[PDB]
Amino acid sequence: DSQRSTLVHWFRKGLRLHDNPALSHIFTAANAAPGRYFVRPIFILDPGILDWMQVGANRWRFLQQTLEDLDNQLRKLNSRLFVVRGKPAEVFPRIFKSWRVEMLTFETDIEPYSVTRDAAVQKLAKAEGVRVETHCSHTIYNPELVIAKNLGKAPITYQKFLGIVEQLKVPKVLGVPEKLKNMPTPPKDEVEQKDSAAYDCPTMKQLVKRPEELGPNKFPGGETEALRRMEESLKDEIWVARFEKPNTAPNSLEPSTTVLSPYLKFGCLSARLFNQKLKEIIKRQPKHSQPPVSLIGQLMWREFYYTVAAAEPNFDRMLGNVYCMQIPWQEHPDHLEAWTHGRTGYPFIDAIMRQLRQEGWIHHLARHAVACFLTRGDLWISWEEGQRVFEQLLLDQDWALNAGNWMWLSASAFFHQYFRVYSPVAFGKKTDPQGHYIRKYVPELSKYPAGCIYEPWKASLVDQRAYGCVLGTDYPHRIVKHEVVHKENIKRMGAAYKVNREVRTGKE
DNA sequence: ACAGCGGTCGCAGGT
DNA sequence: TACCTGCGACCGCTG
Ligand SMILES: Cc1cc2nc3c(=O)[nH]c(=O)nc-3n(C[C@H](O)[C@H](O)[C@H](O)COP(=O)(O)OP(=O)(O)OC[C@H]3O[C@@H](n4cnc5c(N)ncnc54)[C@H](O)[C@@H]3O)c2cc1C
């Protein structure tokens, strides 16, 4: 066994065993040629990034848990995870030689950074004699094929996108890979010979530098929890079939939706598996909703944003972004800081921003509320600042999805009915008239009557004292007046739309 | 051409 | 309940 070659699967996203072609191919190959190969499933961890502030503690914890679950599952196939510390640029040249790699597989990714990184690896592999198999299993439909089907253009409307993808084939959904037979552990490389635990899963202490930012562990990481959570969500087939996104609550104390987003984001759950489960349920349920609103439709919204994002390296910025309306956002540093930390003085908005920071997930319509307030609705701050904060705090932080919906919400792309504006005060009342959500995440206001808990400034000073929370002392004065600024912002939006119309017809 | 339709998720005030 | 209308007057697509 001093003559074996190594087959490598590289996990970046797709942190799962189920429905993983790139991974299954590796395991099938090893079992086909017994005694021929060694198998190294790996995750590359840059130890320098741990202090990057664009990754919150909660997301680090989620990744830590995911890596441990992935190692446990690989253990059952007579394998394990190898978490190799370093950067791909130095790691691969070293391990290609060290491990005598014959093949390298991974799941493809459309994010710019990932496109250039992978291209470098492909170039190295080519020159070094290592075969590379890539698979597009992160999404149901391959953005490339969708764009090609639509004559070289990413569809910019949902219904057109649907019209294209129903013409495309849906790939077969795989099971978990086969158990490796006659696979002894590979010989230690020079790094392992020095430290036997060099490729072990990172500890919490290792991945999480600021444990004080950790909140309640409501959504544990990993494929196991992913599948358990999915199964629980699909248990009630009526709820699933009649799902309409607009009717789900932003402020329910428990999630009104599936909360599968962190799992789909990391690849802990296969979007293709989830799509298949849904379809089987809809066939059994005669009464059911349709896209855009349906649960299947939500999954297609994921696919839509990935397709437009795949055609635009600047997707996450206003300038140079083909889709994006050019809007004169302003700098408001105090207001930005107050929004960022849930200190706007709008209890509903503050409640949401605090849940987000604490727990890593907020409901889609809660995101609408705070995104609207930040941008077109009140503060007139750029969506790129909001995007940045979300990137830091969300467990499900996704380059394409985050950019896409921020553009939607700011009416910069895809959505253009800017006359519709969420009220920081009224929107939440509909589903939570008593303000239970506010009382929980803004505890200082928990004695306010429902009559003014969404608008504490309506309470007199004597009232404020009787509720044991005086505005300007225990809770902030509202940083702006929604009833005024939103009307003026509407006109700013109309004005900016006009300027863009000129430019568009001006190039003709 | 340029109008009419549809567009995941507005609000307030009706009924 | 779950519709409805006024508000003021958007874009992409279609033909
Ligand atoms: C300003 C803003 C930023 C956002 N940033 C992200 C992000 O960084 N990462 C992320 O995954 N989602 C993001 N979303 C979309 C959406 O809010 C979340 O996907 C959803 O809240 C996750 O909860 P869920 O899993 O219960 O969704 P469900 O309603 O159960 O839907 C199921 C799955 O469909 C997909 N999905 C649902 N809604 C959307 C949507 N609007 N766009 C794309 N895919 C969707 C997700 O994969 C979700 O897990 C953002 C939305 C807004 C308005």
The DSSP line for A310-363 is: HT-TTTTSSTT-SS---------HHHHHHHHTT-SS-HHHHHHHHHHHHHS---
Confirm or reject: Cβ of A138 under 6 Å from ligand 1. Answer: no
- Residue A473 corresponds to which tokens in the numbers above? 């002392």
A291 and A356 share one domain:
no
Q: Rounded to an integer, what distance in angstroms lies between the CA atom of residue A271 and that of residue A77?
A: 23
Residue of A387, A467, A457 lying closest to A424 (CA atoms) = A457
With a CB cutoff of 8 Å and minimum separation 6, the contacts of A41 are A8, A9, A11, A23, A26, A74, A79, A80, A81, A82
* CATH number where A231 lies: 1.25.40.80
Q: Are A376 and A488 in contact (CB under 8 A)?
A: no
A128 and A85 share one domain:
yes
Q: Are A356 and A393 in contact (CB under 8 A)?
A: yes
A246 and A299 share one domain:
yes
Which amino acid, one-letter code, is at A134?
T
Confirm or reject: Cβ of A300 under 6 Å from ligand 1. Answer: no
- Closest atom of ligand 1 relative to the A362 alpha carbon: 21
Q: Are A378 and A490 in contact (CB under 8 A)?
A: no
CA atoms lying within 13 Å on the CB side of residue A489: 27
- Residue A200 corresponds to which tokens in the numbers above? 């072990």
Compute, in angstroms, the gap from residue A45 CA to the centroid of ligand 1. 26
Number of H-type helices and E-type strands within chain A: 22, 5
Q: Rounded to an integer, what distance in angstroms lies between the CA atom of residue A133 and that of residue A227?
A: 26
Residue of A390, A400, A321 lying closest to A362 (CA atoms) = A390
The domain of A303 spans 138-173+223-312
Q: Rounded to an integer, what distance in angstroms lies between the CA atom of residue A117 and that of residue A10?
A: 13
- Let me know if residue A167 belongs to a domain: yes
Q: Rounded to an integer, what distance in angstroms lies between the CA atom of residue A143 and that of residue A270?
A: 17
Q: Rounded to an integer, what distance in angstroms lies between the CA atom of residue A120 and that of residue A88?
A: 9
CA dihedral sign of residues A379, A383, A138, A88:
negative
Resolution (A): 2.3
- A485: exposed, middle or buried (C-beta count within 10 Å: 0-12, 13-18, 19+)? middle
A326 and A466 share one domain:
yes
A345 and A307 share one domain:
no
Compute, in angstroms, the gap from residue A364 CA to the centroid of ligand 1. 6
- Let me know if residue A115 belongs to a domain: yes
A window 404-443: Cβ near strand B (< 7 A)? 414-417, 419-423, 425-427, 430
**Residue owning tokens 């009104």:** A256
Residue A5 CA and nucleotide C15 C1' are separated, in Å, by 62
Q: How far, in Å, are A45, A83, A118, A129, A195 from residue A124 at the CA level?
A: 19, 21, 10, 9, 27
A69 and A150 share one domain:
no
Backbone angles phi, psi at A43, to 5 degrees: -130, 130
- Annotation-wise, does A257 bind a ligand? yes
Q: Which residue is nearest to nucleotide C9 (CA to C1')?
A: A419
Rg for chain A, CA atoms, rounded? 25
- How many distinct structural domains can be found in chain A? 3
A350 and A291 share one domain:
no
A148 and A277 share one domain:
yes
**A116 beta partners:** none
With a CB cutoff of 8 Å and minimum separation 6, the contacts of A475 are A345, A442, A444, A445, A456, A469
Q: Give residue A259's region: left, alpha or beta (phi > 0; psi -120 to 50).
A: left
Q: Rounded to an integer, what distance in angstroms lies between the CA atom of residue A63 and that of residue A84?
A: 15
Compute, in angstroms, the gap from residue A452 CA to the centroid of ligand 1. 31
Q: Rounded to an integer, what distance in angstroms lies between the CA atom of residue A335 and that of residue A380?
A: 10
